[PDB]
Amino acid sequence: MRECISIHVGQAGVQIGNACWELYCLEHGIQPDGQMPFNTFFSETGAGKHVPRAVFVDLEPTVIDEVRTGTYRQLFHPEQLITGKEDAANNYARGHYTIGKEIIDLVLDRIRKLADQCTGLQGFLVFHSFGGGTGSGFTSLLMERLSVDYGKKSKLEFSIYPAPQVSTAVVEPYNSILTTHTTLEHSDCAFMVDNEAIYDICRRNLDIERPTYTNLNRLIGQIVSSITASLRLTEFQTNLVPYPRIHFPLATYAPVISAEKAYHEQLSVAEITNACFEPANQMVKCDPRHGKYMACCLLYRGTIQFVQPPTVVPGGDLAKVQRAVCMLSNTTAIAEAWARLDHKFDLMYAKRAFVHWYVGEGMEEGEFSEAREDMAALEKDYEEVG
């Protein structure tokens, strides 16, 4: 009766959600037509069918239609899968102001039915990213609507944070500063991951070259399942955050090793606890030695300056390790990542690059300055709590 409801928004959201629900139906005995040959995330029909508590939303049909046609089509109720007509064009302008008003009503109504079929509410799991248009603006609209609506029940978000050096979109600092500006207060807590740090840890811990997105989202699904494996969630919210702005913990997983080295090396509790604090094995590419740790949570499935076993995925790379630890840490290392991201925003906003699309769609020239000053306020708040 300890339920949680999952919404997966944007393309990064639905590809990490597919790997997630793969891992959960793997973890229970649920073969993926829904019938056992558990009800914290599932609802059980009287016929013997298991339906997830999940809503998928995107504005290109070509990323939901893969889920609707592929091998998980007999898992869902087929109007849980929200689908637009034109994508948000990597615009906060289009996800927030112009296109998202055709689907926000259906999103809220399916949230309303999935949150009336339950018996005790604990939180929602919103899976998103800080690059794209519907990963920023529609998530901010959904965020403000659900914090105004449901009140104090906890919303956890999982964000692919834009990397220190390498990114696909040119426009990314604009969307990231603008989404954090209005997704500070509404969300209860969100977690940071970086593609570049996951690429380096995928290069050197598990000895694979040329990784890809399924090899990343397997790791992200293992981390999320390790967070919410103590139910088969308000404690994190009253533990980690000192003040109501610093709600971005970092995460890692300690025994991420292949089978060929896992056969020789044992995994003691001491080995996995120190492997969490090694900066080579962090999963957000910041420098933690310039930071000082303000909090740690260490979930054990199965100079360091303070201020049920894991499952196995078919076609997987992480070896079967008897015990593992997921670290949900909170550091003072993100003061350099925010400085570099807001500097990347500042270079483009010195001469108004790419601004006139969002200007002609919805916002004024000072509506970016408001986000700029409200992120300078965030780095004076880390410097203040230094």
Binding site: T62, E86, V170, P211, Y213, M348, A350
Partner: protein, 427 residues
């Protein structure tokens, strides 16, 4: 559900356009009958973007072919893949424009401009929620460019909140065919700098040097050049048709590219190009593909990057391929080479990866460059416009039916101000 409506203009478009619809169609498994014969189930999923459905389970393209001599429509319809269209959509005049701006813009195209927007209307009205259009042409001739610059600007005044993609085969000066090509290209950028939301600049001189050194072909006809052009529109809207591990839409790719509005001219380029005598020896991976898509000879514009500094870069990739090898390989080209990139853009490179390659290839990509030295393609047209127009070499055949001496010099500095707008951002 995020659709598009194709259109044509002139002879140079119709050889590209009718080559385009035998590149999309056989990549969708569709016979020239229209009967679907395809292995995969993904193909019938997104037919609704470019096509429409006839009774019987047949598929019709969403396109209109327009020109001012009926010899160029009979050539298309008699072709191998020309029957698929609507015979009611074939629209053409009878009195030829004959490289006349004043005909194709002012008098002759104005008794076809009633008929062509109705075919634009009733075919872009069955669509549920539009994304934009397409127009394929050149900027040398009269009705391929003067009607082509009216068909944009009228359509801009009815559906102005969509994305009207266009093409442009630019007049090469050193590969020239018409004596008066400055008088038609300089009057064409005037009504096209303000009415398209993106527009490519390919030209026939660089399409020869991509075809004499990399391809090393002996005899290039006009069926192997427009094959190169129709296979780099399929790259830039594959995400609009097919899923992938990271997809960028049409309208996503507009926002990230243009720094300030008047800078929306691009430079296309197709990444794997090999001669048929040297294909087996060449290994196909991503580091051995990024060195061919940044090459100065695999660029389908006559301009050069190294006489300028880059602004933004897109690169849609296609195939089964890991994403670390995209993310850091294009860091590295950005990282070592630092002079050629601007410094108030801290990350100069986009990406997008589909899952479905072009037919018969293990791996492919498509470059989109936005250089700053493309002003050298605009300095080389204006200096061929300060010579003929100073002694008034040819004006009395265009100004005999509608314009004035002031109409050209109103639209000459409106093409010459764009050189200086690149110059202020050049350093």
């Amino acid at each position: 559900m995020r659709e598009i409506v194709h259109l044509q203009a002139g002879q140079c478009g119709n050889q590209i356009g009718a080559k385009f619809w035998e590149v999309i169609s056989d990549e969708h498994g569709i016979d020239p009958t229209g009967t679907y014969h395809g292995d995969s189930d993904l193909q019938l999923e997104r037919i609704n973007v470019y096509y429409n459905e006839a009774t019987g389970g047949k598929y019709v393209p969403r396109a209109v072919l327009v020109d001012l001599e009926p010899g160029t429509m009979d050539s298309v319809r008699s072709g191998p893949f020309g029957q698929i269209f609507r015979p009611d959509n074939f629209v053409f005049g009878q009195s030829g424009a004959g490289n006349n701006w004043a005909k194709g813009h002012y008098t002759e195209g104005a008794e076809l401009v009633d008929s062509v927007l109705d075919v634009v209307r009733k075919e872009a009205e069955s669509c549920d929620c539009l994304q934009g259009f397409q127009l394929t042409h050149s900027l040398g001739g009269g009705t391929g460019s003067g009607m082509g610059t009216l068909l944009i600007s009228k359509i801009r005044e009815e559906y102005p909140d969509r994305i009207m993609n266009t093409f442009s085969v630019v007049p090469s000066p050193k590969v020239s065919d018409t004596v008066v090509e400055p008088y038609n290209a300089t009057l064409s950028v005037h009504q096209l700098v303000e009415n398209t939301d993106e527009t490519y600049c390919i030209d026939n001189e660089a399409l020869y040097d991509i075809c004499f050194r990399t391809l090393k072909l002996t005899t290039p006809t006009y069926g192997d050049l427009n094959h190169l052009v129709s296979a780099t529109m399929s790259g830039v809207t594959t995400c609009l048709r097919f899923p992938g591990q990271l997809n960028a839409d049409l309208r996503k790719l507009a926002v990230n590219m243009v720094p300030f509005p008047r800078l929306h001219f691009f430079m296309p380029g197709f990444a794997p190009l090999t001669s048929r005598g040297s294909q087996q020896y060449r290994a196909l991976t991503v580091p051995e593909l990024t060195q061919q898509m940044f090459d100065a000879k695999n660029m389908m514009a006559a301009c050069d990057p190294r006489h300028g500094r880059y602004l933004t870069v897109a690169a849609v990739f296609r195939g089964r391929m890991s994403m670390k090898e995209v993310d850091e390989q294009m860091l590295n080209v950005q990282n070592k080479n630092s002079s050629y990139f601007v410094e108030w853009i801290p990350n100069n490179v986009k990406t997008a990866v589909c899952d479905i390659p072009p037919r018969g290839l293990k791996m492919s990509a498509t470059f989109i460059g936005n250089s700053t030295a493309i002003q050298e393609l605009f300095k080389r047209i204006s200096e061929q416009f300060t010579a003929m127009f100073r002694r008034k070499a040819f004006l009395h055949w265009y100004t005999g039916e509608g314009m004035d001496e002031m109409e050209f010099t109103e639209a000459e500095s409106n093409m010459n101000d764009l050189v200086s707008e690149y110059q202020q951002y050049q350093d």
